[PDB]
UniProtKB/Swiss-Prot annotation, chain B:
This is Alanine racemase. It holds the Pfam family Ala_racemase_N. It comes from Geobacillus stearothermophilus. One of its GO terms (molecular function) is pyridoxal phosphate binding. The keyword Isomerase applies. The gene is alr. Disulfide bonds: none annotated. The active site is at K38 (proton acceptor), Y264 (proton acceptor). Belongs to the alanine racemase family.
């Protein structure tokens, strides 16, 4: 595809391939990698990342809810897909026909799915167990047994796996982590027979403790080259390559005189003879209003966003009079300088996870693999 | 169309018809309404709002950049569309074939476009004037006259319009509004002749000074029923009807015992026996992490979000054991209680404009017209 505005994101699939193949090296031959590709693969592109990760050593994929999995299937992915979240009992027949595995955590769910679905496809279920996260999961013994029993009893229901999720695996202090690991090991005994896929680890516990991950790792944020926390960074076994960058170009350049105002509410006043540039990105692109005092890169230099950020545009104070068409990097490298996603997150007072997720549908993704432009994805 | 997670946004298109029709009543009949549906009609659905607005009295449409205008053509809109922002000179040809008017503000763009285009279709240009916003637009007489000449010389370039935009039209104090209006009046005398469409007003300027709008208004945020700012809410001529609401359903319910922790970084700890509900909506849905100390409505009552927000789900403290499948309203009414976009905006410390825009592609839109469902639009749909 192609696009008709000079704002785009670039996704480096070679960086995603290396982050996966290095864990494939660091893990046991027995142990599968489930690449987590929810939320349009954290804002990087679901198909493009799912494909790259399966080439690199992942055998399975994971999504957040059923529409994200049906979308991967429609685009030609035929690899296994687990929905990590919840679904409707009434949609278990769709999941089955499309070979999507479902998370289960409540007995009344199954009771209901059983009435509604008679066959002929099998449906593979993963039992989530709540250890100390408080989000989804079974917590008591007789609720586990009732699920196992409702699955055992139905001809087309299969328990392929079971799992938990750690609240504090990114935290230096492993004390809630070892409470959750112990609680899990104990809950695994409520089950007759240990199922074929037992998994517990997100990117953090799988790069910190790769042996105490059983036979499947779910690998998320670190695939994208982003650390789980600041605290976990000098504890990780290999370097992560960063996959996402964001670029734009100057579309107007003007010399402002003193006392001249810029943007909504006229909250910026020019004090000297300043060159101001307009770039075609704003908050509907996910470049949120709170980035008003932040530095982008223009011609190797940091340059401040001056005045309020608009829906589709914002302004920067230029080093001097640059030509229209000059590339501005908002996330990425411009020679000598770098802005990382971690930098953007610092200013928005979030975690890195939130940032590529918020760069919207409006922003094209240009994909690079084997150091060459592979593909353009423009959503509108 | 269909969706398979119990999180959806509803857009009431009757509200959008009323907000636009009320403006057609308010404005002089010789003054046209340009409805601006940029950013997927401010997160509400571009072609659905565009079709409704053109029914209530709008005649033109405005968008931010060319892909948004071309996407409206593909979905069957034949009305005039103006691209308010910048475009590539190379694309002048496509814009002209698809009858999209363009904003122009620099002569080097036109120098470059004369060279790449030579009919047969006309390209309608709207010259942008910077009178005090500092974004796009001419600021000089030599450059205004150069653009006009380069337009006059090519047989296929047409100046259909002329505009400016206000930085503080939504402030109670009109002092900067007045400098900018007076500066537009002076800047208009730099042109040999007046083109057919002179426009300046946004929602705030047109709701406040209907008589000072010349012959076209560019109506945005007030179409969706959101006030331009809270300062001018008492100054507004007719009531505005909010079109957007956001909803979810409980997918998990459980009681905690005293001392158990909830979510990432295990921030929250229950202190009595409490019922915790999980909803399938998180920050990749635009329900951003900073809303962690906010609340949602469950069964007519306010209930807090408990712990950190996750990518695709968050937890809330419930009043007691509620059923799984209970509707939760994040933005909208439940009984006597209401949560508005201005509430969310205040907690997020932003303007209301930024909130529907950030509710992402992931969240389905269900459209209502004549109090019944008209269509579902799931962007990651089949």
């Amino acid at each position: 595809n192609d696009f008709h505005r000079d704002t785009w994101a670039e996704v480096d699939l070679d960086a995603i391939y290396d982050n996966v193949e290095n864990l494939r090296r660091l893990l046991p031959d027995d142990t599968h990698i489930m690449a987590v590709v929810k939320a349009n693969a954290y804002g990087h592109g679901d198909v493009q990342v799912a494909r790259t990760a399966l080439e690199a050593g992942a055998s399975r994929l994971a999504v957040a809810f059923l529409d994200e999995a049906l979308a991967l299937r429609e685009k030609g992915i035929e690899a296994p897909i687990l929905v990590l979240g919840a679904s409707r009992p009434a949609d278990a027949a769709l999941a089955a026909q499309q070979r999507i595995a479902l998370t289960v955590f409540r007995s009344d769910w199954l009771e209901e799915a059983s009435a509604l679905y008679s066959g002929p496809f099998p449906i593979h279920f993963h039992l989530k167990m709540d250890t100390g996260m408080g989000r989804l999961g079974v917590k008591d013994e007789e609720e586990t047994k009732r699920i196992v029993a409702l699955i055992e009893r139905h001809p087309h229901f299969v328990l392929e796996g079971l799992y938990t999720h750690f609240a504090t695996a990114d935290e230096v202090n492993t004390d809630y982590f070892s409470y959750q690991y112990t609680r899990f090991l104990h809950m695994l005994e409520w089950l007759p027979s240990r199922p074929p896929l037992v998994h517990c680890a997100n990117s953090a516990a799988s790069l910190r403790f790769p042996d105490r991950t059983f036979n499947m790792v779910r690998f998320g944020i670190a695939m994208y080259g982003l650390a789980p926390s600041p605290g976990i960074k000098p504890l990780l076994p290999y370097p992560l390559k960063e996959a996402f960058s964001l670029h734009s170009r100057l579309v107007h350049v003007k010399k402002l005189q003193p006392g001249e105002k810029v943007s909504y509410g006229a909250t910026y006043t020019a004090q000297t003879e300043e060159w101001i540039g307009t770039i075609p990105i704003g908050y509907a692109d996910g470049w949120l209003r709170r980035l008003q005092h932040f530095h982008v890169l223009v011609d190797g230099q940091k340059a401040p966003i001056v005045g309020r950020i608009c829906m589709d545009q914002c302004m920067i104070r230029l080093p001097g009079p640059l030509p229209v068409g000059t590339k501005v990097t908002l996330i990425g490298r411009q020679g000598d300088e770098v802005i990382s996603i971690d930098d953007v997150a610092r200013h928005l007072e979030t975690i890195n996870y939130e940032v590529p997720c918020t760069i919207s549908y409006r922003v094209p993704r240009i994909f690079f693999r084997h150091k060459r432009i592979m593909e353009v994805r423009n959503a509108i």
